[PDB]
Amino acid sequence: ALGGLEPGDPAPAFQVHTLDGMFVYSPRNESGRALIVHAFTNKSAFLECLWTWSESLSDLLDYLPSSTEVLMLSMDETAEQDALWMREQVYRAAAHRGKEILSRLHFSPTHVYNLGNWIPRVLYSWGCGGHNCGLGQVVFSSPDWKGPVIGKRLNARYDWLYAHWSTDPYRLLDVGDGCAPVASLKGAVAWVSEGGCSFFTKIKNMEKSNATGVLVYALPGNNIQDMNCKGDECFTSLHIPASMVHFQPKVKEALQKGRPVNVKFQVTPSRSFFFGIDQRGVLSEMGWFLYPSFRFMAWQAQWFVFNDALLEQLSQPAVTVSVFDHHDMHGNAGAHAVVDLPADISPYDVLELDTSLSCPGRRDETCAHWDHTVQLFVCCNDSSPYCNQELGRWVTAFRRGTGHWLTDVSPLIPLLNNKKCSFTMKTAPWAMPWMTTLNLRFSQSNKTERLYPFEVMPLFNGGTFDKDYNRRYHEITFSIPAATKKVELYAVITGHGSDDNNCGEFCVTSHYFLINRSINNTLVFEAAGSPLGCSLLVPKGGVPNECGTWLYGRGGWCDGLQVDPWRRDITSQLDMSGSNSVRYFGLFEGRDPNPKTDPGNILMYSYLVFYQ
Amino acid sequence: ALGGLEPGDPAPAFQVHTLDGMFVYSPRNESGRALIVHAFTNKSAFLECLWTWSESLSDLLDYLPSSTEVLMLSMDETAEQDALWMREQVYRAAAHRGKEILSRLHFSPTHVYNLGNWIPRVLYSWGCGGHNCGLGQVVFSSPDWKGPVIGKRLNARYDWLYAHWSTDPYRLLDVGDGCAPVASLKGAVAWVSEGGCSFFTKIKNMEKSNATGVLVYALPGNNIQDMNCKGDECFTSLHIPASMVHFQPKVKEALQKGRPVNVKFQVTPSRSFFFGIDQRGVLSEMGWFLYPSFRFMAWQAQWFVFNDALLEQLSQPAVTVSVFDHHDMHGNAGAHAVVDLPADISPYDVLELDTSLSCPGRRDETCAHWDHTVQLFVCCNDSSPYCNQELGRWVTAFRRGTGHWLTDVSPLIPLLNNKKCSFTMKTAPWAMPWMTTLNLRFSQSNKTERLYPFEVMPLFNGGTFDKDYNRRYHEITFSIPAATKKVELYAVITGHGSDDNNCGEFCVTSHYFLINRSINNTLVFEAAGSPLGCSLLVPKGGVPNECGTWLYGRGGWCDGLQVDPWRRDITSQLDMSGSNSVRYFGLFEGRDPNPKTDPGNILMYSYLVFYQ
């Protein structure tokens, strides 16, 4: 019944009533605007802050694409008033700003249990149970009270306090504002009031007072806020959890009486608050929301656009060779396959890889909970140096299986020196299983002065980022073959791990390919270490709304995205008729690395390509 | 997260608050009382009638086992009052009756969105979308009204009106009581008021007035009722649908004004209203509810008991041989396998078959929507008559995959005359795929005077139930081998199809095995044709709450249950030293069948077994 209501299936047509009229969705054979259906409920402080926080509304008005529509439903019994409240909030935010986006926003006062469509089934069956998704509740219990008092809570920013609450009951002690250290609480959760001083200061003072946790209650008539640091506050690390709730007269009266009070934290599973329909009418999951900002939706929308632009590229003329079709990957072997390439790949001067790393199930919940590198090695002649050489590199997403990327690896065509070859896609041995689908697309460029690769010589590999990292690399002297018109450097470099300086994965590390000991060739990961360095690559293929730190700018790569190779032309630098020398070296802050604890890692694959 | 929350997985421990105290469920290594969790919502007239209809409460108080517990939650915002209302209704029903059952009923005033447990996830993810499950709603729309009016509706009894509503909009005409024929409505749904005359009379008069449907509105302050016939009314067949709703002043005022009024019918998907935990802590689906009566729960509970009693039997000492392990079945081939039986099965005088017919997925929604016969044939020597002979017969359930039966087929042991044999489980070729798991259990009986079968001779087969049915059967003359102490008749007979007399599947047909033309041997399907003939076999293995007419008493079989063979001893009738004659014949009402239209079918497999 109702057809397929799982990710990847088409979205059946439907009709809804809204303050502006009848909103009708009908599948089309063409590509149109993507849709985002959002279900709002007053029982979650996450959505309340989403719709009340000015930053979230500004992000929605600014970063939302111009080719996306949003529909809002209310699962609460006050849907009629809830829709009007949301519309008023949006209009007030858009005041003295753009107003075209309003035409793409629709608010349905209809009750969820009266739609008469397939939407409630999707909302119920697409349960999130993850980051900032799932009603977080706080239960206050006292012997005097005949029953508990249940309220909403919003956990602090994921990037500030990594400590998590425990299901075991806690105590509760009144500490007023909480920004002045007290004698001691003896492992009793603090009951503090927002305002007066800083939030970070409150948490720090409570931790210094021997407190297992803190609970900020908003003053009457106020709203919950997202707890986060500001500059100097973030360097300091706090090892206790915290959350913000509303004000309850009962707990205050009990504390004044001196009666014991206990507090418990729970996560009640809820219904999906977001689900998207792609530009082609395909149902898609919107991932997780790390913190209450509408930006997470916009990024998802951006991805949809890219996906469409991707699906148009694959439809173009090209010779397709399928290597993997949902082939399972896990362990050392990973995914091994053997293919028979066309008889003659010489005319094809362009080679691309279309890759899709999905999970065993359609839903994202059945995916790996970590990001692990993936490498594609190719072997066509064991008696040649090209065997087991890396052809492409990718990075998995945090519990997402919608990844679909296209990478240009044309200069590595000479590695395929045999009509029959073997391809091995490998990841971390201890990684959870994945399902890889890979296709090689051969094509001829539109360039008039077409050039064809004929030789690929590996230059240097990676290694541990230690003080001896640059001591293992020696100058390579090579002579250029005749009938050569162009020389290129093709290097795939990625830093991993953390050290005293958080280097490797979050390091601004420079890599130099000195040529003829006379000219530099620099690759720098400037975006590394930035809070949102990897958030700008979603239009380019990055998978957004991942269950992890997918926003941090990494060194040379990003989560849920292929590693775009670094290609440089050095035909001018080299002496086309004579010998040349090349030497690699990596540096940090302009000096060799000196990691005293937990040294990082550098995975590199470098090649020198000669064109006819 | 939350472990496995699908059918067949264990139920994690949990705690809930109720008017009587703290209800705690903790898995145990032993077997205890089964549990039934029911979610109630005021938005469904089905549950409202369930909790307001006296018949349903009486059925709950009478047929509910004494080893079952029921917990009730309310998904509505009035849970506190809803639980008290349910408790008051139950107590009033139990007045002047038994009160022990009350100790096994618990009512939780806690809101569903505040449980803090795994129950809401199951309720949301176990969507029903089927018979009398899924909010049936009626939408009244008029040009004068700025918005539609949505109300609850309860479709008439499934066994009375098979006509179904259409998603297309209808009209609405006021016809008062509706038990007096009018001029004509011209394909306009009738708007009638309950009371004054009979419901069947109202529907008949409306159909005679050229009406596409009828809608009964209950008087203000009244409640919806289940539409059904009474004796003479049921013989007559009506080809239009009908439903009962509440009274709306707006539609009445509009009709008085003469303004056009349109009515539409929809089915909004909802959350699961019932889910059960077996005696061993395994989550189990409760199937569908054909009409609003609590009996459907009780039957399910009964099944649980049987299941436990079944699982204890399998744990007993026995030689187990697995033939199928979730082997797929579909098409003509069905499921074919080859097994190597023990070296010597002579000492094992008892042979049983443990069978489980599940679906491709754990959920019942992925199951076949029809009941189809299943037969197990065995071949051990192509040069022997025993090849391709039937060993066991089963009947699938309407969209249920919890079937697990144990059938005694010991007299058919001689069919296994070779250590290696081939087993073929076959169903209707056009049937949806199933997954069969079969095990043969050999055991030695506790009887002191043990007897061992050594010869099985087929006697007669089935055929089409026509006037020539008995003309194709001739007397079989057989001589008994020496060293024989007992002779048995083992016949598996099943009627199928319908005819002018509804014979075959719903026929009281007698089968006679005349022996030596001197003594009868009668098998009669007395329960055939009864409304609840097959409802009494749930404790014996019948799968209850099927998506079909599983309550009707069939001829010699029942839905979701094995066909228990008919075994009779005739050692006295036969001349142990001499020849004997046997002749089969089937009769209806004491006479040969004379089906003028759509003749039925009789599937029979008969054997004469000789014991040492």
Ligand SMILES: *[C@@H]1O[C@H](CO[C@@H]2O[C@@H](C)[C@@H](O)[C@@H](O)[C@@H]2O)[C@@H](O[C@@H]2O[C@H](CO)[C@@H](O)[C@H](O)[C@H]2NC(C)=O)[C@H](O)[C@H]1NC(C)=O
């Ligand atoms: C190739 O570059 C290296 C490294 O210099 C880096 O880039 C410079 C522009 C500057 O930012 C340095 O701090 C970087 O480390 C050159 O060798 C180094 O040159 C620097 C001065 O630029 C000197 O202090 C170091 O001792 C040199 N050696 C090292 C770092 O090992 C090199 O000269 C460049 N090649 C050329 C210009 O042909």
Ligand SMILES: *[C@@H]1O[C@H](CO[C@@H]2O[C@@H](C)[C@@H](O)[C@@H](O)[C@@H]2O)[C@@H](O[C@@H]2O[C@H](CO)[C@@H](O)[C@H](O)[C@H]2NC(C)=O)[C@H](O)[C@H]1NC(C)=O
């Ligand atoms: C075996 O039974 C048949 C069938 O009789 C049936 O059972 C009877 C008790 C009675 O209910 C009949 O109406 C049933 O049909 C006997 O043969 C028939 O006997 C009936 C009278 O009982 C007679 O009218 C029929 O013509 C007979 N023949 C038929 C129905 O084909 C038969 O005699 C029985 N065998 C015995 C007693 O040894």
Ligand SMILES: *[C@@H]1O[C@H](CO)[C@@H](O[C@@H]2O[C@H](CO)[C@@H](O)[C@H](O)[C@H]2NC(C)=O)[C@H](O)[C@H]1NC(C)=O
């Ligand atoms: C969402 O729920 C919160 C929490 O109940 C509501 O917050 C209330 O807001 C009103 C209006 O400012 C205050 O008077 C109350 O004191 C607040 N707390 C309560 C009622 O507990 C909030 O209004 C709700 N939002 C919507 C749109 O209904």
Ligand SMILES: *[C@@H]1O[C@H](CO)[C@@H](O[C@@H]2O[C@H](CO)[C@@H](O)[C@H](O)[C@H]2NC(C)=O)[C@H](O)[C@H]1NC(C)=O
């Ligand atoms: C379930 O919903 C129905 C339909 O709304 C309620 O029926 C109402 O019952 C009251 C009390 O007898 C009447 O006064 C109303 O006229 C009825 N119809 C309405 C309100 O539309 C019924 O009470 C509800 N049950 C519970 C337990 O809340």
Ligand SMILES: *[C@@H]1O[C@H](CO)[C@@H](O)[C@H](O)[C@H]1NC(C)=O
């Ligand atoms: C916290 O407890 C520790 C236990 O070792 C104690 O040394 C310390 O002084 C306490 N700090 C307070 C009460 O601020």
Ligand SMILES: *[C@@H]1O[C@H](CO)[C@@H](O)[C@H](O)[C@H]1NC(C)=O
């Ligand atoms: C590998 O290359 C060598 C080069 O001498 C060639 O002789 C050999 O046949 C090649 N092997 C295959 C399997 O193509």
Ligand SMILES: *[C@@H]1O[C@H](CO)[C@@H](O)[C@H](O)[C@H]1NC(C)=O
């Ligand atoms: C119903 O319509 C049919 C159309 O053939 C007509 O013959 C019949 O008289 C009508 N019956 C009524 C209006 O009762």
Ligand SMILES: *[C@@H]1O[C@H](CO)[C@@H](O)[C@H](O)[C@H]1NC(C)=O
């Ligand atoms: C079948 O039975 C016959 C009886 O003569 C015997 O000769 C033959 O070997 C048997 N076949 C098998 C496969 O057991």
